[PDB]
């Protein structure tokens, strides 16, 4: 308004165009001439492309209507607001908690890191320090802090350029057209700038709580700049990751002692209102109250570096099957893992090529040793399987949709060439992923309670085929072990001669080159058979629970509410659409699902009903204990290790996480038996009451249980 | 309370404005005016309103549903429910349910093979409405509505 440059600038807005003609009177009468339904547009243009449009004078969609305070408009980067030491600490504290809200809380980049007026100032001068306040804390100490976080976001940009995870749902990087080119300094300059500002704090004679927190803040930012080392140099060192944990722990105790208030307008929605913005205005989400997010980030990255210590294909396989299973890892670590696993020199972990790494998995699973297109395509398929493990809890299940049809195509191509060793491994990976893809839907609340029988029996059906395949694989390996054992039996009977040397020569060769792997794979197949029978028994318990619920008339295998649009057969095929093109194992018909349910459902009444119901509950309580025993056996072998000679789990890198997984699996097992007692005791007594309650079944997640097997809990139906 | 369900009159602009007026109050994601003209101008037959004939304002829309249909992939037509809202004083009367029925029945007349829609995992009112009509959850999108929560992709197969 009263600004001089805005007054003279109003004359220059039209200067670029030499001549202007008013067309408002023409537009009004022409638009008045059009029919109300018609829209004038380019025929090529699709009107869907106009749904992301902004609207002027719409508070929810106009960035120019953002209301700011006087302080938020008047904030100057060159003014050193008093008190300097307390404000710089308050400004620096806000920035690190803005970094956490951006990354840990999945908040937009303009709301958090770019809301800072100092961050926008430093990045703007680089495109062509930025502010000279006359105070050493704002000019050098804060100037180093802003550069470190700005250097951090540039590294986050390079992680997203790898296309590992999905933009604006795993991580938002809306930088509002900010491209620092090569003008942003290197890692050496940023660390030295932070170290020089750090030694200024060390040399300060005064001592205060605000100074001590600022000492740690510069140290924390130094550690974040060092996160790049795990990608450029692939260093497994936890030095800077341990410092970041320790410094955050020290700061978390300081927050109760002091209260920080930054200069008014230092962090605001100002950048949305004046800088080029093609998105609606957005408020600033509430920021974290502690530095606990830095601890979580540093621990997750430390876990990523553990996969470098793997010696076998099973240890990398089990790492991918557990590192991101119990809870979703930080997005920085979830991006860093496929880039750390699949490296720049086209090698996996710097030890194996893409084809070597695939041949390891087949060798360690089939216990047999033998560069064409089929092996090359399978190697790329296996790596995409590893990369999907680091996706979020939703994208994790979506990734199997692509894999299942590609594994099946890959298996059929192996069968046409009659390469049965690779065909078997592809069948294992496919059938394992089919079970995983199906049981994951319970974790995501995809299946409604009435679809529980369909999915739980299907996984049971699949688990029966996987156990059959696995037991035959162990039988084939068992005969190979006996063949070497029979040579030792035959050598003892043989007299010393030339033909005994031939058998002794081949016995040692097979004993030195084949015996160790056959034993290791035999013990590994023992673990797989125990886990699949646990997963198979849990599904059967869930099917028996559903049948008891239908027998009492509480739930059906279809939608109970009537509708005049669809039918059960169409809805059932839609649920099982992904498994439609898979030939082995064949998807059971709609009639097989129905007929199998009637085998479990009790249609008897009275005393005959009570007899068949007792056999069903007795199986649930018995099988739960048999599952607890099998889980207990597995947990001992994981604690003992693989060199004991009974089981091979390959969980050395993820021992604690795998033990936590089975303990949660044991909780759900015990919970399934407790719930079956409640259901029986409730519904038996409910039959006696003529004016009984009305129940509905809900799929409930046990808090410390494994959410792939929710508890079919019945609850009283009350109207709203 | 006498409720009448009407197909959208594209020439009636005060009815058009009351549709946007109602939807905008109850939406989290704000819609520009060309979001509405993408649906209503191109698919006028797939937007229905509910009016109260015995109310003080008979023709004002107390509720409305906005739909569209396009061929999905290549061999199937997929109807889509984009917007559904009922006035706050009129909820609990089965109004939205009949608006969805008359919309899906219209799209079924137009040879749609399926109806698709997205909704929040926390929208228990909308989930019970659709799933009670036969919809099932086919997908969960992580943070589809940002800090509102995740979303469910619902599909009702018709053919």
């Amino acid at each position: 308004p009263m600004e001089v440059d805005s007054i003279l600038g109003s004359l220059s807005i039209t200067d670029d165009f030499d001549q202007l003609v008013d067309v408002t009177s023409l537009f009004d009468e022409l638009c008045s001439k059009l029919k109300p339904e018609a829209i004038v547009k380019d025929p090529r243009f699709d009107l869907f492309e106009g749904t992301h449009s902004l609207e002027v004078n719409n508070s929810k969609l106009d960035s120019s209507l953002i209301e700011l305070t006087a302080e938020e408009i008047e904030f100057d980067v060159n003014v050193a607001y008093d008190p300097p030491l307390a404000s710089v600490a308050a400004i620096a504290d806000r920035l690190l908690r803005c970094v956490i809200s951006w990354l840990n809380d999945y908040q937009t980049l303009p709301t958090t890191v770019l809301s800072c007026r100092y961050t926008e100032s430093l990045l703007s001068s680089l495109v062509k320090s930025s502010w000279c306040t006359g105070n050493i804390l704002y000019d050098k100490v804060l100037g180093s802090c802003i550069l470190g976080v700005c250097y951090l976001t540039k590294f986050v940009q390079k992680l997203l350029s790898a296309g590992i995870v999905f933009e604006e749902e795993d991580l938002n990087f809306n930088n509002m057209g900010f491209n620092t080119f090569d003008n942003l300094p290197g890692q050496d300059v940023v660390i030295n700038s932070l170290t020089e500002s750090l030694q200024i704090l060390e040399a300060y004679s005064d001592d205060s709580l605000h100074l001590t927190m600022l000492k740690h803040i510069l140290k924390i930012i130094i550690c974040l700049v060092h996160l790049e080392d795990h990608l450029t140099d692939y260093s497994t060192k936890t030095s800077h990751l341990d410092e970041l944990i320790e410094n955050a722990n020290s700061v978390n105790g300081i927050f109760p002692q002091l209260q920080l208030s930054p200069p008014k307008g230092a962090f605001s929605t100002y950048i949305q209102k004046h800088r080029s913005n093609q998105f609606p205005p957005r408020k600033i989400t509430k920021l974290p109250t502690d530095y606990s997010g830095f601890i979580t980030l540093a621990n997750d990255v430390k876990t990523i570096l553990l996969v470098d210590k793997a010696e076998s294909a099973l240890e990398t396989y089990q790492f991918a099957k557990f590192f991101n299973k119990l809870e979703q890892r930080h997005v920085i670590a979830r991006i860093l893992f496929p880039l750390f696993f699949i490296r720049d020199d086209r090698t996996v972990l710097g030890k194996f090529s893409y084809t070597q790494f695939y041949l390891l998995h087949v060798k360690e699973f089939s216990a047999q040793t033998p560069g064409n297109e089929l092996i090359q395509e399978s190697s790329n398929m296996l790596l995409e399987w590893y990369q999907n493990c680091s996706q979020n809890t939703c994208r994790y299940r979506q990734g199997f949709n692509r894999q299942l049809i590609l594994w099946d195509s890959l298996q059929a191509q192996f069968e046409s060439v009659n390469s049965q060793v690779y065909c078997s491994w592809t069948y294992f990976m496919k059938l394992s992923s089919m079970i995983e893809f199906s049981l994951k839907g319970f974790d995501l609340d995809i299946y409604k309670p009435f679809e529980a029988y369909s999915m739980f029996w299907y996984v049971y059906y699949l688990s029966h085929h996987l156990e059959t395949f696995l037991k035959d694989s162990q039988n084939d390996i068992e005969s190979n072990i006996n063949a070497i054992h029979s040579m030792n039996k035959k050598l003892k009977k043989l007299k010393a001669g030339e033909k005994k040397d031939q058998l002794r020569l081949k016995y040692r060769f097979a004993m030195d080159n084949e015996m160790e792997q056959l034993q290791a794979t035999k013990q590994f197949l023992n673990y797989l058979l125990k886990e699949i029978n646990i997963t198979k028994s849990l599904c059967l318990i869930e099917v028996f629970q559903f049948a008891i619920l239908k027998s009492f008339g509480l739930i059906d295998n279809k939608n109970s509410t009537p509708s005049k649009f669809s039918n059960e057969r169409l809805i059932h095929n839609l649920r099982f659409k992904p498994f439609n093109s898979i030939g082995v194992p064949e998807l059971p018909e709609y009639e097989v699902f129905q007929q199998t349910l009637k085998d479990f459902v009790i249609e008897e009444k009275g005393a005959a009903f009570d007899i068949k119901l007792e056999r069903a509950t007795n199986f649930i309580e018995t099988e739960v204990r048999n599952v607890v025993s099998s889980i207990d056996e597995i947990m001992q072998g994981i604690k003992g290790g693989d060199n004991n000679g009974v089981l091979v789990t390959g969980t050395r890198l993820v021992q604690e996480l795998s033990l936590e997984y089975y303990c949660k699996l044991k909780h759900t097992s015990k919970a399934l038996s407790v719930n079956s007692k409640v259901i029986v005791n409730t519904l038996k007594k409910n039959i006696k009451n003529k004016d009984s309650h009305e129940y509905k079944v809900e799929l409930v997640h046990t808090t410390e249980g494994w959410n792939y097997f929710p508890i079919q809990t019945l609850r009283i139906k009350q109207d709203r | 309370m006498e409720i009448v369900y009407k197909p959208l009159d594209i020439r009636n602009e005060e009815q058009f404005a009351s549709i946007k007026k109602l939807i905008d109050a109850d939406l989290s994601e704000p819609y520009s005016i060309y979001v509405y003209r993408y649906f209503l101008n191109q698919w006028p037959e797939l937007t229905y309103i509910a009016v109260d004939n015995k109310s003080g304002t008979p023709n004002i829309p107390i509720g409305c549903i906005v739909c569209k249909m396009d061929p999905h992939r290549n061999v199937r037509l997929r109807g889509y429910i984009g917007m559904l809202a009922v006035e706050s004083t009129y909820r609990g009367h089965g109004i939205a349910k009949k608006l969805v029925e008359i919309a899906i029945d219209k799209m079924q007349r137009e040879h749609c093979d399926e109806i698709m829609l997205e909704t929040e995992v926390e929208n228990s009112a909308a989930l019970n409405l659709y799933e009670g009509m036969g919809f099932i959850r086919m997908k969960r999108m992580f943070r589809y509505y940002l800090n509102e929560g995740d979303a469910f992709k619902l599909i009702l197969p018709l053919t």
């Binding site: 749904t51 992301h52 | 939406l27 989290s28 994601e29 819609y31 979001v35 984009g82 917007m83 559904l84 997205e118 909704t119 589809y144 509505y145 979303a151």
Partner: peptide, 4 residues
Amino acid sequence: MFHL
């Protein structure tokens, strides 16, 4: 609902 509809979300872009």
